Scaffold this active site. Structure first.
Site, PDB file in Angstrom:
ATOM      1  N   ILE A 174     -53.954 -22.956  47.255  1.00  0.00           N
ATOM      2  CA  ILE A 174     -52.946 -23.577  48.127  1.00  0.00           C
ATOM      3  C   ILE A 174     -51.920 -24.415  47.336  1.00  0.00           C
ATOM      4  O   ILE A 174     -50.776 -24.560  47.765  1.00  0.00           O
ATOM      5  CB  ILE A 174     -53.646 -24.413  49.261  1.00  0.00           C
ATOM      6  CG1 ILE A 174     -54.282 -23.497  50.335  1.00  0.00           C
ATOM      7  CG2 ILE A 174     -52.719 -25.466  49.897  1.00  0.00           C
ATOM      8  CD1 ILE A 174     -55.255 -24.234  51.310  1.00  0.00           C
ATOM      9  N   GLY A 175     -52.346 -25.012  46.240  1.00  0.00           N
ATOM     10  CA  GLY A 175     -51.470 -25.866  45.455  1.00  0.00           C
ATOM     11  C   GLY A 175     -52.105 -26.317  44.168  1.00  0.00           C
ATOM     12  O   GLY A 175     -53.259 -25.980  43.885  1.00  0.00           O
ATOM     13  N   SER A 176     -51.329 -27.064  43.373  1.00  0.00           N
ATOM     14  CA  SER A 176     -51.734 -27.589  42.066  1.00  0.00           C
ATOM     15  C   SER A 176     -51.015 -28.921  41.789  1.00  0.00           C
ATOM     16  O   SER A 176     -50.249 -29.399  42.637  1.00  0.00           O
ATOM     17  CB  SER A 176     -51.455 -26.568  40.961  1.00  0.00           C
ATOM     18  N   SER A 215     -55.495 -31.585  39.415  1.00  0.00           N
ATOM     19  CA  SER A 215     -55.963 -31.341  40.775  1.00  0.00           C
ATOM     20  C   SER A 215     -55.488 -30.019  41.337  1.00  0.00           C
ATOM     21  O   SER A 215     -54.287 -29.756  41.359  1.00  0.00           O
ATOM     22  CB  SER A 215     -55.550 -32.489  41.691  1.00  0.00           C
ATOM     23  OG  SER A 215     -54.275 -33.003  41.335  1.00  0.00           O
ATOM     24  N   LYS A 216     -56.433 -29.192  41.802  1.00  0.00           N
ATOM     25  CA  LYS A 216     -56.144 -27.898  42.401  1.00  0.00           C
ATOM     26  C   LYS A 216     -56.695 -27.835  43.843  1.00  0.00           C
ATOM     27  O   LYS A 216     -57.875 -28.099  44.053  1.00  0.00           O
ATOM     28  CB  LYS A 216     -56.704 -26.760  41.522  1.00  0.00           C
ATOM     29  N   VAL A 217     -55.832 -27.501  44.832  1.00  0.00           N
ATOM     30  CA  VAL A 217     -56.197 -27.342  46.253  1.00  0.00           C
ATOM     31  C   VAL A 217     -56.353 -25.836  46.514  1.00  0.00           C
ATOM     32  O   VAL A 217     -55.478 -25.069  46.122  1.00  0.00           O
ATOM     33  CB  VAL A 217     -55.194 -27.994  47.255  1.00  0.00           C
ATOM     34  CG1 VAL A 217     -55.805 -28.098  48.648  1.00  0.00           C
ATOM     35  CG2 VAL A 217     -54.732 -29.361  46.778  1.00  0.00           C
ATOM     36  N   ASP A 221     -44.284 -44.044  50.356  1.00  0.00           N
ATOM     37  CA  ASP A 221     -43.780 -42.809  49.763  1.00  0.00           C
ATOM     38  C   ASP A 221     -43.845 -41.648  50.748  1.00  0.00           C
ATOM     39  O   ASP A 221     -44.285 -40.561  50.386  1.00  0.00           O
ATOM     40  CB  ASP A 221     -44.507 -42.494  48.435  1.00  0.00           C
ATOM     41  CG  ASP A 221     -43.932 -41.318  47.650  1.00  0.00           C
ATOM     42  OD1 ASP A 221     -42.720 -41.361  47.303  1.00  0.00           O
ATOM     43  OD2 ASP A 221     -44.684 -40.340  47.411  1.00  0.00           O
ATOM     44  N   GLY A 275     -51.464 -32.772  39.093  1.00  0.00           N
ATOM     45  CA  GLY A 275     -52.057 -33.612  38.056  1.00  0.00           C
ATOM     46  C   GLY A 275     -53.569 -33.571  38.058  1.00  0.00           C
ATOM     47  O   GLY A 275     -54.208 -34.345  38.786  1.00  0.00           O
ATOM     48  N   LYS A 316     -60.140 -29.567  47.642  1.00  0.00           N
ATOM     49  CA  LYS A 316     -59.338 -30.149  46.581  1.00  0.00           C
ATOM     50  C   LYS A 316     -60.291 -30.447  45.424  1.00  0.00           C
ATOM     51  O   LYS A 316     -61.320 -31.093  45.616  1.00  0.00           O
ATOM     52  CB  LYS A 316     -58.602 -31.402  47.053  1.00  0.00           C
ATOM     53  CG  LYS A 316     -57.772 -32.100  45.987  1.00  0.00           C
ATOM     54  CD  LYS A 316     -57.667 -33.535  46.374  1.00  0.00           C
ATOM     55  CE  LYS A 316     -56.377 -34.177  45.989  1.00  0.00           C
ATOM     56  NZ  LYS A 316     -56.184 -35.417  46.772  1.00  0.00           N
TER      57      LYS A 316
HETATM   58  C1  LIG Z   1     -46.132 -23.424  50.833  1.00  0.00           C
HETATM   59  N1  LIG Z   1     -47.564 -23.751  50.920  1.00  0.00           N
HETATM   60  C2  LIG Z   1     -48.195 -24.030  49.619  1.00  0.00           C
HETATM   61  C3  LIG Z   1     -48.317 -23.311  52.045  1.00  0.00           C
HETATM   62  O1  LIG Z   1     -47.889 -22.401  52.767  1.00  0.00           O
HETATM   63  C4  LIG Z   1     -49.600 -23.987  52.402  1.00  0.00           C
HETATM   64  C5  LIG Z   1     -49.589 -25.369  52.495  1.00  0.00           C
HETATM   65  C6  LIG Z   1     -50.666 -26.055  53.005  1.00  0.00           C
HETATM   66  C7  LIG Z   1     -51.799 -25.369  53.445  1.00  0.00           C
HETATM   67  N2  LIG Z   1     -52.857 -26.035  54.071  1.00  0.00           N
HETATM   68  C8  LIG Z   1     -53.633 -27.121  53.619  1.00  0.00           C
HETATM   69  C9  LIG Z   1     -53.168 -27.920  52.529  1.00  0.00           C
HETATM   70  C10 LIG Z   1     -53.952 -29.057  52.218  1.00  0.00           C
HETATM   71  C11 LIG Z   1     -55.159 -29.353  52.939  1.00  0.00           C
HETATM   72  C12 LIG Z   1     -55.541 -28.509  53.968  1.00  0.00           C
HETATM   73  N3  LIG Z   1     -54.820 -27.410  54.334  1.00  0.00           N
HETATM   74  C13 LIG Z   1     -55.684 -30.559  52.425  1.00  0.00           C
HETATM   75  C14 LIG Z   1     -54.859 -31.050  51.444  1.00  0.00           C
HETATM   76  C15 LIG Z   1     -55.039 -32.326  50.740  1.00  0.00           C
HETATM   77  C16 LIG Z   1     -54.785 -32.695  49.369  1.00  0.00           C
HETATM   78  N4  LIG Z   1     -55.145 -33.991  49.146  1.00  0.00           N
HETATM   79  N5  LIG Z   1     -55.659 -34.458  50.337  1.00  0.00           N
HETATM   80  C17 LIG Z   1     -56.350 -35.748  50.455  1.00  0.00           C
HETATM   81  C18 LIG Z   1     -55.578 -33.490  51.325  1.00  0.00           C
HETATM   82  N6  LIG Z   1     -53.759 -30.113  51.286  1.00  0.00           N
HETATM   83  C19 LIG Z   1     -52.668 -30.203  50.385  1.00  0.00           C
HETATM   84  O2  LIG Z   1     -52.603 -31.097  49.549  1.00  0.00           O
HETATM   85  O3  LIG Z   1     -51.690 -29.227  50.543  1.00  0.00           O
HETATM   86  C20 LIG Z   1     -50.530 -29.128  49.631  1.00  0.00           C
HETATM   87  C21 LIG Z   1     -51.039 -28.616  48.297  1.00  0.00           C
HETATM   88  C22 LIG Z   1     -49.687 -28.086  50.324  1.00  0.00           C
HETATM   89  C23 LIG Z   1     -49.753 -30.420  49.467  1.00  0.00           C
HETATM   90  C24 LIG Z   1     -51.827 -23.927  53.317  1.00  0.00           C
HETATM   91 CL1  LIG Z   1     -53.238 -22.967  53.845  1.00  0.00          CL
HETATM   92  C25 LIG Z   1     -50.730 -23.232  52.783  1.00  0.00           C
END
Ligand SMILES: CN(C)C(=O)c1ccc(Nc2cc3c(cn2)cc(-c2cnn(C)c2)n3C(=O)OC(C)(C)C)c(Cl)c1
Length: 252
Positions: free
Chosen positions: A17-19, A23-25, A133, A21, A39
């Site tokens: 889902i993301g990357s 940290s990889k989601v 922020d 510092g 995460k």
């Molecule tokens: C363009 N992007 C990357 C997407 O379409 C995208 C974005 C977000 C998605 N869902 C998603 C992102 C999520 C989480 C749960 N679900 C939890 C988190 C999270 C990270 N730190 N903390 C405390 C919670 N999270 C998250 O950080 O998402 C981003 C990487 C998109 C910022 C999904 Cl499934 C796809």
């Protein structure tokens, strides 16, 4: 295709889902074939100031679970000296990406999201947290409902930055940021997105002589909200409890 273990329980990775510092989601599937987000935080090159900021975010996320459904659900976690695993609910997309893709925002989805944002930010304020922020990226769409993903405790855009944060920080700081997000959802730009130069942008945000253009729209209620939030003096800016009682949020 991969797999990871959080508290004895096995999760199969679907996609990343993301990357960031160290940290990889990821989007994962558990043994009951249910969808979640994991995460992973690497603590190998992390210091005590960093560890305690991370420990503080997990604690606040864990406590604020019970107080609001506008806060991301944290199902489980594993913490060691080498890493962190956080098992959370999966959203469909973040607000920033959803706004970047969308050519137009429906007035009903807008009002609905605004309500969600105020309830989430209101909740953190009741616990002594001021984010400072806020950006659309801190918001997640989860079944038509916006949820707050972090508390600013643990993009560097400056477009949602309050004048007081530039001056060198009260619950009013978050009102300015929420105002900028609603301004984007209203006019299709942030109030200072037109300013290419980053220093001139900072000089424009603090400067009272620099008039923020509020073009006339059908929703005059929505216009007053924006005008209330985007008052450069924290003392003259509307509070979250007052925003929740505003006709824009309340009148049907
Ligand atoms: C363009 N992007 C990357 C997407 O379409 C995208 C974005 C977000 C998605 N869902 C998603 C992102 C999520 C989480 C749960 N679900 C939890 C988190 C999270 C990270 N730190 N903390 C405390 C919670 N999270 C998250 O950080 O998402 C981003 C990487 C998109 C910022 C999904 Cl499934 C796809």
């Amino acid at each position: 295709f991969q797999s990871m273990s959080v508290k004895g329980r096995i999760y199969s990775i679907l996609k990343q889902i993301g990357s960031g510092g160290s940290s990889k989601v990821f989007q994962v599937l558990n043994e009951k074939k249910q969808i979640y987000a994991i995460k992973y935080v690497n603590l190998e090159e992390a210091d005590n100031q960093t560890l305690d900021s991370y420990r503080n975010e997990i604690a606040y996320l864990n406590k604020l679970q019970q107080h609001s459904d506008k806060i991301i659900r944290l199902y489980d976690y594993e913490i060691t000296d080498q890493y962190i695993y956080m098992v959370m609910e999966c959203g469909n997309i973040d607000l920033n990406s959803w706004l970047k893709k969308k050519k137009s925002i429906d007035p009903w989805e807008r009002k609905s999201y605004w309500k969600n944002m105020l309830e989430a930010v209101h909740t953190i304020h009741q616990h002594g947290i001021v984010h400072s922020d806020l950006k659309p990226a801190n918001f997640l769409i989860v079944d038509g409902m916006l949820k707050l993903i972090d508390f600013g405790i643990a993009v560097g855009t400056v477009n949602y930055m309050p004048p007081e944060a530039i001056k060198d920080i009260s619950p009013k700081s978050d009102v300015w940021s929420l105002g900028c997000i609603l301004y984007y959802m209203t006019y299709g730009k942030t109030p200072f997105q037109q300013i290419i130069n980053q220093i001139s942008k900072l000089h424009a945000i603090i400067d009272p002589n620099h008039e923020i253009e509020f073009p006339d729209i059908p929703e005059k209620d929505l216009q007053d909200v924006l005008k209330c939030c985007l008052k450069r003096d924290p003392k003259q800016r509307i509070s979250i409890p007052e925003l929740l009682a505003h006709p824009y949020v309340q009148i049907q």
